[PDB]
Amino acid sequence: TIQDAVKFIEQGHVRVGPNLINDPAYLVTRNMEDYVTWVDNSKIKKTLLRYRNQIDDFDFS
């Protein structure tokens, strides 16, 4: 839900390409609907990878 999305990107978990996003007012372009991914060591990324038990930990997340 979008409230949870503002929770996550206000806690600073996501990035678009390289740079992290802290404010929810950043709207994206047509180009950057593909590199919307969390940062690494984001523990939600860690918990979903360990849910699928594809949790690789050599890549530090």
């Binding site: 919307v36 991914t37 969390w38 939600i44 918990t47 979903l48 849910y51 038990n53």
Partner: peptide
């Protein structure tokens, strides 16, 4: 089912993936 599978989008996060494993 195969179409959902190949459009999985592996950033699929919910809150129930601490009861499911």
């Amino acid at each position: 089912l195969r179409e959902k599978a190949k459009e999985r989008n592996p950033d699929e996060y919910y809150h129930a993936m601490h009861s499911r494993k």
